[PDB]
Structure formats: structure tokens, C-alpha cells
Design an enzyme around this catalytic site. Sequence first.
Site, PDB file in Angstrom:
ATOM      1  N   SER B  27      -5.925  -5.108   2.813  1.00 12.03           N
ATOM      2  CA  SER B  27      -6.385  -5.796   4.029  1.00 12.03           C
ATOM      3  C   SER B  27      -6.696  -4.804   5.139  1.00 12.03           C
ATOM      4  O   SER B  27      -6.357  -3.621   5.033  1.00 12.03           O
ATOM      5  CB  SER B  27      -5.331  -6.793   4.521  1.00 12.03           C
ATOM      6  N   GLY B  28      -7.331  -5.291   6.204  1.00 13.65           N
ATOM      7  CA  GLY B  28      -7.698  -4.451   7.324  1.00 13.65           C
ATOM      8  C   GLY B  28      -9.201  -4.316   7.468  1.00 13.65           C
ATOM      9  O   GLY B  28      -9.974  -4.709   6.599  1.00 13.65           O
ATOM     10  N   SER B  29      -9.621  -3.759   8.590  1.00 13.90           N
ATOM     11  CA  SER B  29     -11.033  -3.680   8.900  1.00 13.90           C
ATOM     12  C   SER B  29     -11.770  -2.782   7.905  1.00 13.90           C
ATOM     13  O   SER B  29     -12.910  -3.089   7.561  1.00 13.90           O
ATOM     14  CB  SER B  29     -11.214  -3.186  10.335  1.00 13.90           C
ATOM     15  N   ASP B  82      -6.851  -0.157  -0.635  1.00 12.77           N
ATOM     16  CA  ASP B  82      -6.261  -0.568   0.637  1.00 12.77           C
ATOM     17  C   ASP B  82      -6.561   0.435   1.718  1.00 12.77           C
ATOM     18  O   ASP B  82      -6.890   1.564   1.424  1.00 12.77           O
ATOM     19  CB  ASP B  82      -4.726  -0.727   0.510  1.00 12.77           C
ATOM     20  N   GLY B  83      -6.430   0.011   2.970  1.00 11.80           N
ATOM     21  CA  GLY B  83      -6.484   0.902   4.105  1.00 11.80           C
ATOM     22  C   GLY B  83      -5.077   1.353   4.464  1.00 11.80           C
ATOM     23  O   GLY B  83      -4.115   1.067   3.725  1.00 11.80           O
ATOM     24  N   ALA B  84      -4.969   2.045   5.595  1.00 16.46           N
ATOM     25  CA  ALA B  84      -3.699   2.548   6.125  1.00 16.46           C
ATOM     26  C   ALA B  84      -3.838   2.766   7.621  1.00 16.46           C
ATOM     27  O   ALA B  84      -4.889   3.217   8.088  1.00 16.46           O
ATOM     28  CB  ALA B  84      -3.315   3.853   5.472  1.00 16.46           C
ATOM     29  N   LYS B  95       1.623   1.237   7.047  1.00 12.70           N
ATOM     30  CA  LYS B  95       0.734   0.098   6.900  1.00 12.70           C
ATOM     31  C   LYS B  95       1.396  -1.115   7.505  1.00 12.70           C
ATOM     32  O   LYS B  95       2.614  -1.124   7.770  1.00 12.70           O
ATOM     33  CB  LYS B  95       0.475  -0.160   5.418  1.00 12.70           C
ATOM     34  N   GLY B  98      -1.989  -5.109  10.571  1.00 10.01           N
ATOM     35  CA  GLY B  98      -2.661  -6.414  10.525  1.00 10.01           C
ATOM     36  C   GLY B  98      -1.707  -7.529  10.107  1.00 10.01           C
ATOM     37  O   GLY B  98      -2.103  -8.702  10.034  1.00 10.01           O
ATOM     38  N   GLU B 104       0.889  -6.418   0.583  1.00 11.77           N
ATOM     39  CA  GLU B 104       0.261  -5.123   0.290  1.00 11.77           C
ATOM     40  C   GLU B 104       1.146  -4.194  -0.534  1.00 11.77           C
ATOM     41  O   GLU B 104       0.645  -3.462  -1.399  1.00 11.77           O
ATOM     42  CB  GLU B 104      -0.168  -4.409   1.568  1.00 11.77           C
TER      43      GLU B 104
HETATM   44  O1  LIG Z   1      -3.497  -4.309   5.833  1.00  7.43           O
HETATM   45  C1  LIG Z   1      -3.314  -3.371   6.744  1.00  7.43           C
HETATM   46  C2  LIG Z   1      -2.363  -3.795   7.815  1.00  7.43           C
HETATM   47  O2  LIG Z   1      -1.676  -4.932   7.283  1.00  7.43           O
HETATM   48  C3  LIG Z   1      -3.947  -2.170   6.677  1.00  7.43           C
HETATM   49  O3  LIG Z   1      -4.801  -1.840   5.686  1.00  7.43           O
HETATM   50  C4  LIG Z   1      -3.756  -1.130   7.732  1.00  7.43           C
HETATM   51  O4  LIG Z   1      -3.326  -1.791   8.933  1.00  7.43           O
HETATM   52  C5  LIG Z   1      -5.108  -0.422   7.969  1.00  7.43           C
HETATM   53  O5  LIG Z   1      -5.990  -1.213   8.779  1.00  7.43           O
HETATM   54  P1  LIG Z   1      -7.519  -0.824   9.168  1.00  7.43           P
HETATM   55  O6  LIG Z   1      -8.221  -0.500   7.868  1.00  7.43           O
HETATM   56  O7  LIG Z   1      -7.910  -2.117   9.862  1.00  7.43           O
HETATM   57  O8  LIG Z   1      -7.468   0.355  10.106  1.00  7.43           O
END
Ligand SMILES: O=C(CO)C(O)[C@H](O)COP(=O)(O)O
EC number: 5.3.1.6
Lengths: 233, 233
Positions: B27-29, B82-84, B95, B98, B104
Site C-alpha cells: 500500500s501507499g502512494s 510494497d513501499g516504505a 512502514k 498509511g 503488510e
Molecule cells: O503501506 C504503507 C504505509 O502503510 C507504505 O507503503 C509506506 O507508508 C510507504 O508509503 P508511500 O509509498 O506512500 O510513501
Amino acid sequence: NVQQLKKMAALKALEFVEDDMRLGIGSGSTVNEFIPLLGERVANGLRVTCVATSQYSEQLCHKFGVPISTLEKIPELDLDIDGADEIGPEMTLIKGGGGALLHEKIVASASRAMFVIADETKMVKTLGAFALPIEVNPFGIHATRIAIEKAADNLGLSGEITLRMNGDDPFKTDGGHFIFDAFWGRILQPKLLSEALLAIPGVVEHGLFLGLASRAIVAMADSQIKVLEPFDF
Amino acid sequence: NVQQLKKMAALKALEFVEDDMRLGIGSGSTVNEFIPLLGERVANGLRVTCVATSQYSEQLCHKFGVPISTLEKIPELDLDIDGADEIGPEMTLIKGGGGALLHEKIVASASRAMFVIADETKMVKTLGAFALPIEVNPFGIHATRIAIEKAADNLGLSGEITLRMNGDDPFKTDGGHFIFDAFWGRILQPKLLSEALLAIPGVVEHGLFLGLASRAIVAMADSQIKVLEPFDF
Ligand SMILES: O=C(CO)C(O)[C@H](O)COP(=O)(O)O
Ligand SMILES: O=C(CO)C(O)[C@H](O)COP(=O)(O)O
Ligand SMILES: [Cl-]
Ligand SMILES: [K+]
Ligand SMILES: [K+]
């Protein structure tokens, strides 16, 4: 017989309860003998405020006139009174056979002292004959199962791991979780097993209480009620 | 411009997705840039099955024709994307910004490899500037706040511990939990802090992903896209 031992244990533990104490109240058949006794004392003037660890413990408190509050209102308690499924070395416990371990464990950690009430059969040379309960998240439970199997393998633990059922559905805790019971028979290294289980993402908590219990009040078959310390184990 | 970097990271990671893989979807942008791209590949005949880690990621999955299954059906995944919020030494992550940390971390744990997708800004020399999320049980949350404050003192950490809000209602995660964000600013001993937090009964999980990420795909402002391994941190 054991019901006798439980009541004896409960009466003796009740002697440590003093006015204006904030109490944690545990769960299970031994604690169910303690609550009404406490209520009899409250009806004769004893002032206490209690945090219950389960719905049935809370019900009993209301029924017997034991004042009830929450950890929101009283975050730090003076004394916790609870049972155990097992009491082993250094007074490490197994708890959660009735499914209340999460609230019990939180309440024990919020208390200055935790007293265990028990009949003598709860005392074991080594932990594990009683299946260890493990509170788990419903999400990804299948993968959580596999991770507990693999952790068990690495540590040399053997036995069925069973999802606790309520008739046809999984049993669901107060915290909205499911429980696995792990029939590992013997836990020699509880501190390592606890660390490995807690590190598994889907594992919320487990029934090994380590360095939480300060006294065990144990009623013996020969009528002795021993007040024991962790050094006695 | 960072959105560009996010897309660039996402496009590059997409190249490791091969036919008939079982995928974790974070999740995440940054991951929101990846799902449509994946959808476009699916439209073209790429075959995947994905487990999503948040409602929004699942919503995007359905919106772009990315097929969706469960860890119940597929307990072990080939690849997690996944993001971080932070990527630090040894590719330890923070992490959960969000709110989706638990799902995750279960998904990450259930995969053969976890690929982190990130823009340059997420790589840090020392973890901790981003507030660490801590998923906690609603029951006894006040007591748990105190125990976290105590664990922090013992590891020499300081800063506000605030509750995640969504309005004037605490934010409730998919697991039915709340979240504390700990603004500790600096975390030099991430493994000890992980051990400590997980030992606290009311702590369900936290945002430190230790030895879970196996590759980081990081888009730099100079247009380089680095495929990095933990040995590179
Ligand atoms: O799921 C997440 C938070 O729950 C993430 O992947 C983490 O916060 C990274 O977010 P982004 O890619 O928005 O910077
Ligand atoms: O709370 C408990 C389980 O959740 C316990 O106290 C444990 O099961 C012991 O119960 P008993 O007093 O029946 O031996
Ligand atoms: Cl009295
Ligand atoms: K955990
Ligand atoms: K915990």
C-alpha cells in the site's frame, strides 16, 4: 476436592486485599471462587475498584457487588489476582485455556504485583503438558499457522497445532482474534519460544507469562496453603 | 517530480513480475503507481494473482483488473511489492504511515521475496525521523501507552507518542486495532526496540520490518534506477 482447594487458595489470597486498592481481576474457575468472597468483603465495608479481564469475570463482579472500572480510568493497578493453567520454573505461567489471555496479560502488566491463585495440580516441574494458547489475527491465519509450525521445528517442538473452535466457527476473543492451541508437551526454553512467537507478524500474543507473577498462592491436597515466590520454583 | 520517481520505481519493479506468479500487493502512494501499470500488463495477457494489504489497494486492484485472492487460498506468495516510509541500514524498513502495517507485514512474511519500491527520499542513513507506527489493542490502551513510554526510556528514546486519528475518532485498522505514532526522531538500535515493543502485551505489531526486504528499487533524481540488496545498506 479441587473446588475445595481453589476456594481455600482464594480465601487466603483475599487476605492481601486492602482498602482503597485498585485490583486486576483474572478469569477461570479458581478466580470465580474468589470474586464472590471479595464481594462479601465489599458488602462489609472493604473499598476496592476492579478491572475485569473477561465478560464472565465482569458479570460475576456486578452480581456480587464488586465495583468495576476500566484501565482507561485506572491505568496502573496495585494488585492482580488471577489463575493459571500451569505454574513452572521461576513461576513462569501458561494461561489462556479459557480464552481470556490477552486482557489477562495486559492487566497483569498494568499491575504492581500479580498473585496467582491455584490448587496444587497447576504446579509443574516443566511447562508444556498444557497446550500453549496463541492469540492470532484472522487475516492471513493460514500463513500464520505455517510460521508457527516452522518456528516450532527450529526450536525442536512437536505436536498438533489446532484452531480453537466454538462448535462450527473459530472461537473469537474479546479483542476480535482467533486462538491456536499448540500441544507441544514440553517447553524448556520459554523465553526463546516467546520471543520467536511474538516476532511472527500474525501472532498477537501468547499464554506464556514470564516474570509477571510475583506470588503463587497454592492450596495443597494435605490442606497447606503455601504462599510462594518465584525463587520457590 | 517525486510522483515521476515513484512511477519510475514502479515501472522497473514491474519487470520482475512474470506470468503465473502469486503476488503480494502493498500500500501507499508508490504502490498506487504500480497497480495501474500491473493492470495494463494484465490487459495484455499477463497472468497474476495478488493478495492486497489494504482496502484502497484492493479497490485499485478491482478498478484495474488485477485478480485478487487470499492468504487462505494461497498461504505462500512468490513476490511482495510494497513501499516504505523509510529504508535504512541493512534495508530495515519503517512502514505503516498509511495505516496498513499489520496486513503488510503478514503478507511480506508470507512471500519468498519482498521488493521495496521507493523514490530517493526514503533512503536514510539512520532510521527514525519518520514516526514509528505501533499497532495496539484498544483494550487497556492507556496502560499500553505507559508501557511503551517505559520501554522508550530504557532504550534512551524521547518524543511524543500520539494516537492515530481519523477525525475525532481513533483510526481503526483492518485488524480492529488502533495505532500510536511514536515521534522518536532517531532509532539506532532497531532490533532491541522491536523485541521490546513486541514483548508489551497490548502491542499487536509495529512498523519496523527487520530482515524482510530483499531488494529495494529506488528512483534517483538523476534518473538512475538502482536495484539494491541489503548488502548495499
Ligand atoms: O503501506 C504503507 C504505509 O502503510 C507504505 O507503503 C509506506 O507508508 C510507504 O508509503 P508511500 O509509498 O506512500 O510513501
Ligand atoms: O484466565 C485463564 C484462562 O483464560 C486462567 O486463569 C486459566 O485458564 C486457569 O483457570 P482455572 O482457574 O480454571 O484453572
Ligand atoms: Cl472487610
Ligand atoms: K507479532
Ligand atoms: K505483544
